[PDB]
């Protein structure tokens, strides 16, 4: 029954910056709250338990604060090993324990525009069943971008990779789903691009013969 409201979905900061992960409760829970750290490549691990105590093995740069209805996980100096996902859990009512929606910690850098590319399906997909048209946004830091699809100026879920440490940017891929060999059914297939600091072409289409 008790619900938790954590910080926004993502927090952007550079190395050594100070991040205060805020997480509020739906009611007074006192100090029955604990935090966790989960890297997407491994199992989760706790950092602060009881909102005042520090777990053994955690560096002193982490610090827990807040009580009652508002809790704040304050980090002093961000290290490359600290960038991960965090969650807050309430422990006032033991059986119905709930967790926060999560908070992402990403490395801050300049606004990198994506290399917007689009490729048509090969002849193999046309010989096969339902064809598809894919759109590509590669190497961009503002992950808040999102790609849609339009027909002649059945959308599918987009896919985003992790932040590559080589450029501290993200890569996004979105595709449009159609019926059997519908690539010859229309002359225009519009990819809807939208990115910060970019022209954001609402209809990026091919030009068939």
């Amino acid at each position: 029954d008790i619900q938790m409201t954590q910080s926004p979905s993502s927090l952007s900061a550079s190395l050594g910056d100070r991040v205060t992960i805020t997480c509020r409760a739906s009611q007074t829970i006192g100090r029955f709250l604990n935090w966790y750290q989960q890297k997407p490549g491994k199992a989760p691990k706790l950092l602060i338990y009881g909102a005042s105590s520090l777990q053994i093995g955690v560096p002193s740069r982490f610090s827990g604060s807040g009580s009652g209805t508002d809790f704040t996980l304050t980090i002093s100096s961000l290290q490359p090993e600290d960038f991960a996902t965090y969650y807050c859990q309430q422990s006032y009512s033991m059986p119905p324990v709930t967790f926060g929606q999560g908070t992402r910690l990403e490395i801050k850098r300049t606004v990198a525009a994506p290399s917007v590319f689009i490729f048509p399906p090969s002849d193999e997909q046309l010989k096969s069943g339902t064809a598809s048209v894919v759109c590509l946004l590669n190497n961009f830091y503002p992950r808040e971008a999102k790609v849609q699809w339009k027909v002649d100026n059945g959308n599918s879920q987009e896919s985003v990779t992790e932040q590559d440490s080589k450029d501290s940017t993200y890569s996004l891929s979105s595709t449009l789903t159609l019926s059997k060999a519908d690539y010859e059914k229309h002359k225009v297939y519009a990819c809807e691009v939208t990115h910060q600091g970019l022209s954001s072409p609402v209809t990026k289409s091919f030009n068939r013969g």
Partner: protein, 202 residues
């Protein structure tokens, strides 16, 4: 080192019986409580069930009535009987231990197991300066990655996470960069035990 084992998670028909297993090592297992927490793909952690030292069991609202957690004091064995599964229960389950104190906190975590509920089966996928990519359709959860140049090109290759399809299958949109001042994109599939490849040119 102190760690928690896990096994039994896998594909299962909707509503079919399923039994999970967890094995502790490196500490007195009889004096610590155990908890079961799941995590849906793209979602956060969610407590499922737990069992205390005295053998009492507890479950969640959407969990009670179909789950059954069991634990044996000997052999450090922990189990979680699951029945009546549905598509909404697909999540990654983690075996966790309850630390000593007065409130429930997870001080030790296991490797975690994956449980997927679907009626589909494994199906062979088809493969479909400039940058291009090969579209993949009809995929399946696999322990391998995508490659290029028939498996020889893996440095400049990017593989996006898969997305679920209506037929109970996945799809991939891996891309690569080739000089254009053209190579065979090869897709290996371990559960299918069959390799498929194609190529695209600028």
């Amino acid at each position: 080192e102190v760690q928690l084992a896990e096994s039994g998670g896998g594909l299962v028909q909707p509503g079919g019986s399923l039994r999970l297993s967890c094995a502790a090592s490196g500490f007195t297992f009889s004096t610590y409580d155990m908890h079961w927490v799941r995590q849906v793909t793209g979602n956060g952690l969610e407590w499922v069930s737990t069992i205390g030292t005295g053998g009492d069991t507890y479950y969640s609202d959407s969990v009670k009535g179909r789950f059954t957690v069991s634990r044996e004091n000997a052999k450090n064995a922990l189990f979680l009987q699951i029945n009546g599964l549905r598509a909404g229960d697909t999540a990654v389950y983690y075996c966790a231990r309850g630390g000593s104190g007065q409130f429930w906190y997870f001080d030790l975590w296991g490797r975690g197991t994956l449980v997927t509920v679907s009626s589909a089966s494994t199906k062979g996928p088809s493969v479909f300066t400039a940058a291009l990519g090969c579209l993949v359709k009809d995929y399946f959860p696999e322990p391998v990655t995508v490659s290029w140049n028939s498996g020889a090109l893996t440095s400049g290759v990017h593989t996006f996470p898969a997305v679920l399809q209506s037929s109970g299958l996945y799809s991939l949109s891996s891309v690569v960069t080739v000089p254009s001042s053209t190579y065979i994109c090869n897709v290996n599939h371990k559960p299918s035990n069959t390799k498929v490849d194609k190529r695209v040119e600028p």
